[PDB]
Design an enzyme around this catalytic site. Structure first.
Site, PDB file in Angstrom:
ATOM      1  N   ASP A 114      30.147  39.048  40.554  1.00  0.00           N
ATOM      2  CA  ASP A 114      31.208  38.162  41.013  1.00  0.00           C
ATOM      3  C   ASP A 114      31.183  38.024  42.541  1.00  0.00           C
ATOM      4  O   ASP A 114      31.078  39.020  43.260  1.00  0.00           O
ATOM      5  CB  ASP A 114      32.556  38.712  40.540  1.00  0.00           C
ATOM      6  CG  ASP A 114      33.717  37.870  40.993  1.00  0.00           C
ATOM      7  OD1 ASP A 114      34.107  36.949  40.238  1.00  0.00           O
ATOM      8  OD2 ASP A 114      34.232  38.134  42.109  1.00  0.00           O
TER       9      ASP A 114
ATOM     10  N   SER B 221      40.854  34.732  38.966  1.00  0.00           N
ATOM     11  CA  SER B 221      40.753  35.493  40.226  1.00  0.00           C
ATOM     12  C   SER B 221      42.016  36.328  40.420  1.00  0.00           C
ATOM     13  O   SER B 221      42.326  37.140  39.531  1.00  0.00           O
ATOM     14  CB  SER B 221      40.296  34.614  41.383  1.00  0.00           C
ATOM     15  OG  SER B 221      39.846  35.468  42.419  1.00  0.00           O
TER      16      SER B 221
ATOM     17  N   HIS C  27      32.134  32.644  40.636  1.00  0.00           N
ATOM     18  CA  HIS C  27      33.524  33.114  40.745  1.00  0.00           C
ATOM     19  C   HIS C  27      34.437  32.085  40.098  1.00  0.00           C
ATOM     20  O   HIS C  27      34.395  30.925  40.483  1.00  0.00           O
ATOM     21  CB  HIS C  27      33.918  33.311  42.213  1.00  0.00           C
ATOM     22  CG  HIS C  27      35.247  33.987  42.402  1.00  0.00           C
ATOM     23  ND1 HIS C  27      35.584  35.173  41.793  1.00  0.00           N
ATOM     24  CD2 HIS C  27      36.336  33.614  43.119  1.00  0.00           C
ATOM     25  CE1 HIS C  27      36.807  35.523  42.141  1.00  0.00           C
ATOM     26  NE2 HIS C  27      37.283  34.598  42.952  1.00  0.00           N
TER      27      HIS C  27
HETATM   28  C1  LIG Z   1      39.704  43.374  44.950  1.00  0.00           C
HETATM   29  C2  LIG Z   1      40.963  43.325  44.027  1.00  0.00           C
HETATM   30  C3  LIG Z   1      41.227  44.392  43.171  1.00  0.00           C
HETATM   31  C4  LIG Z   1      42.330  44.342  42.343  1.00  0.00           C
HETATM   32  C5  LIG Z   1      43.172  43.235  42.360  1.00  0.00           C
HETATM   33  C6  LIG Z   1      42.923  42.163  43.217  1.00  0.00           C
HETATM   34  C7  LIG Z   1      41.799  42.227  44.045  1.00  0.00           C
HETATM   35  O1  LIG Z   1      41.524  41.205  44.901  1.00  0.00           O
HETATM   36  C8  LIG Z   1      41.755  39.915  44.406  1.00  0.00           C
HETATM   37  C9  LIG Z   1      41.078  38.993  45.403  1.00  0.00           C
HETATM   38  O2  LIG Z   1      41.252  37.871  45.303  1.00  0.00           O
HETATM   39  N1  LIG Z   1      40.231  39.565  46.499  1.00  0.00           N
HETATM   40  C10 LIG Z   1      39.498  38.716  47.577  1.00  0.00           C
HETATM   41  C11 LIG Z   1      39.146  39.293  48.795  1.00  0.00           C
HETATM   42  C12 LIG Z   1      38.485  38.524  49.761  1.00  0.00           C
HETATM   43  C13 LIG Z   1      38.192  37.170  49.468  1.00  0.00           C
HETATM   44  N2  LIG Z   1      38.535  36.659  48.309  1.00  0.00           N
HETATM   45  C14 LIG Z   1      39.160  37.369  47.367  1.00  0.00           C
END
Ligand SMILES: Cc1ccccc1OCC(=O)Nc1cccnc1
Ligand SMILES: *[C@@H]1O[C@H](CO)[C@@H](O)[C@H](O)[C@H]1NC(C)=O
Length: 353
Positions: A253, A145, A298
């Site tokens: 995902d 993640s 996920h």
């Molecule tokens: C979307 C993204 C792009 C590039 C790098 C990292 C990113 O996000 C990582 C993450 O963990 N987002 C998340 C948002 C809400 C709930 N859970 C997880």
């Protein structure tokens, strides 16, 4: 179990100024080292970091960490659970910087929190050289993640660090799990005014300034000042990387869908979901080491049942073993690029229940 070590350099800290650290289980017969980056979202301003400190404090502080942790999945030492790397030296690096492993900014009279993810990885590597890593042949930097995105952002810097320190024989490689996101149009959408309404690109652009975040050099040189947020998106940063990287990504995902504002499915949503799978599959077509099943899930690599899912009859531990053989062209019955073509979640019968 893996045993906790807090960093000897206590200037390298979690968000609240407490020392960062790592959990280690050595395997003295082995020259392979697995360093795994934990995930867990991020925070991008004072108000949302304050909320995370109240109810997600282990992701911001080492004060309450336990002395040991059990290795699971790819971090297990039992061949029954981990057919791939059961005899390796195992390291779990807790995520306590809230910066997608990108930050380089200390707590100070001007900063309420420290964002030191990029410096934590470098300091872990340095202190492990004195504990056996100096004799390694392969260092695999893995992560799930936000930790998977952290692999993409940091693998080439680990390689440069070891070369400059005089260890050119250690082969550095990356394994990015569930960290390959798309900056796509959302299914329903809102202008960025708080945590819940800010789209990925707007939230990362603010975070980078709040954290003093850093990205890999070649990607930074392409996108230039103010546009470094582009390098947090796998399909944009991956082509710039020199170290070998294996990409694991569910086609549907759950974190991608959450940021897209998706939750009896009618035509508009059916088309949106099918288009998202097709776009994800398109971004992986020229990634030679990859594993991408058509499932709604996920994370996978530190889950106990990671051995169950298959693409085209090949499990993930098998694909990773085939990758190792390929780095000693294609191998008979030992594939490395495995992407499902069916277009709906759970069209693969092996998907997690
Ligand atoms: C979307 C993204 C792009 C590039 C790098 C990292 C990113 O996000 C990582 C993450 O963990 N987002 C998340 C948002 C809400 C709930 N859970 C997880
Ligand atoms: C502690 O960490 C900083 C930042 O990574 C580093 O530059 C500094 O030299 C370290 N201290 C010592 C004594 O090595």
């Amino acid at each position: 179990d893996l045993r906790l070590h807090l960093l000897l350099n206590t200037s390298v800290t979690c968000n609240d100024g407490s020392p960062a650290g790592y959990y280690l289980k050595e395997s003295r017969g082995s020259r392979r080292w697995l360093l795994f980056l934990e995930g867990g979202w991020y925070c991008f301003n004072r108000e949302n970091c304050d909320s995370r400190y109240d109810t997600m404090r282990r992701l911001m502080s080492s004060r309450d960490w336990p002395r040991t942790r059990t290795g699971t999945g790819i971090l297990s030492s039992q061949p029954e659970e981990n057919p791939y790397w059961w005899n390796a030296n195992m390291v779990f690096i807790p995520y306590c910087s809230s910066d997608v492993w990108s930050g380089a900014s200390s707590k100070s009279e001007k900063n309420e929190y420290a964002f030191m993810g990029a410096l934590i990885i470098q300091e872990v590597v340095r202190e492990l050289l004195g504990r056996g890593l100096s004799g390694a042949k392969v260092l695999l930097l893995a992560g799930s993640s936000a930790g998977g995105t952290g692999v993409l952002l940091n693998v080439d810097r680990v390689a440069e660090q070891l070369e400059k320190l005089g260890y050119p024989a250690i082969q550095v490689r990356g394994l990015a799990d569930s960290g390959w996101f798309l900056d796509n149009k959302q299914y329903r959408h809102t202008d960025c005014v708080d945590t819940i309404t800010c789209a990925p690109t707007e939230a990362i652009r603010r975070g980078i300034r709040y954290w003093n975040g850093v990205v890999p050099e070649r990607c930074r040189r392409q996108f230039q000042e103010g546009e470094e947020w582009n390098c947090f998106f796998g399909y944009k940063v991956y082509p710039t990387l020199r170290s070998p990287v294996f990409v694991v990504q569910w086609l549907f995902d759950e974190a991608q869908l959450t940021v897209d504002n998706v939750h009896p499915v009618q035509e508009g949503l059916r088309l949106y979901i099918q288009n998202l799978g097709r776009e994800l599959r398109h971004t992986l077509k020229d990634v030679p080491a990859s594993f991408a099943p058509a499932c709604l899930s996920h994370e996978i690599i530190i889950r106990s049942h990671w051995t169950d899912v298959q693409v085209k009859g090949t499990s993930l531990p098998r694909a990773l073993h085939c990758w190792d053989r390929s780095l000693h062209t294609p191998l008979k019955g030992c594939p490395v690029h495995l992407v499902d073509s069916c277009p709906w979640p759970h069209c693969n019968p092996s998907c997690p229940t």
